[PDB]
């Protein structure tokens, strides 16, 4: 059983990582869409056209 406990620890750690991982980006999307403006838009477009 010393291995079947370890498998359960690894698996729980993985599921926890998964939830935090999806929350990170799901939140980042809301932060972006809430905090953009045409200066921020211009900076990005003008940076990327300069490597076009």
């Amino acid at each position: 059983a010393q291995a079947e406990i370890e498998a359960e620890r690894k698996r729980a750690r993985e599921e926890l990582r998964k939830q935090v991982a999806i929350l990170a980006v799901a939140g980042a999307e809301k932060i972006i869409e809430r905090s953009v403006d045409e200066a921020a838009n211009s900076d990005i477009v003008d940076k990327l056209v300069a490597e076009l």
Partner: protein, 173 residues
């Protein structure tokens, strides 16, 4: 679908049009023929087995904007093989071969909203350092992307959008 059977006819019609400097007339000719192909009544005729020569004559008659000899001969040749439904694709591949020969390109620019007309200038300038062709943009407005810009040039695209930046991160995790 006609993508493949339309290639030889497009190439032959373009080659012929170049020798006689009338490419700009041939394109109108082919477009009008592809339009008579889309009519409700004609589309019924084209589908029902009828002898190629009679189908060709009854299709020619419905056009007078066609170069007497060299335009109608294409119609007769396609009728021989039954490929008259292909005209809407012969047109597209004709336009494409012309755009190649004239070294011209067309690119979509997709953005959250309208650009500043200096951004448009720099884009329509740099794309020609990517492509040897002259470019005509056709800006577009798309709110699914929420910042940045998409530049699609044929089947090559440069995804400068923030939406792309997001789903290209969510997958790293």
């Amino acid at each position: 679908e006609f993508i493949t059977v339309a290639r030889p006819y497009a190439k032959a019609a373009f080659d012929f049009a170049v020798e006689h400097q009338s490419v700009e007339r041939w394109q109108d000719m082919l477009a009008f023929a592809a339009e008579v192909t889309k009519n409700e009544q004609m589309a019924e005729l084209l589908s029902g087995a009828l002898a190629p020569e009679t189908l060709a004559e009854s299709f020619i008659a419905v056009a007078g904007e066609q170069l007497d000899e060299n335009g109608q001969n294409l119609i007769r040749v396609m009728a021989e093989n039954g490929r008259l439904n292909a005209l809407p694709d012969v047109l597209e591949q004709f336009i494409h071969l012309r755009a190649v020969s004239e070294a011209t390109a067309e690119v979509d620019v997709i953005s959250a909203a309208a650009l500043s007309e200096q951004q448009l200038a720099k884009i329509s300038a740099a794309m020609e350092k990517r492509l040897s062709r002259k470019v005509k943009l056709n800006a577009k407005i798309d709110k699914s992307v929420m910042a940045g810009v998409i530049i699609r040039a044929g089947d090559m695209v440069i995804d400068g959008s923030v939406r792309g930046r997001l789903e290209r991160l969510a997958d790293v995790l």
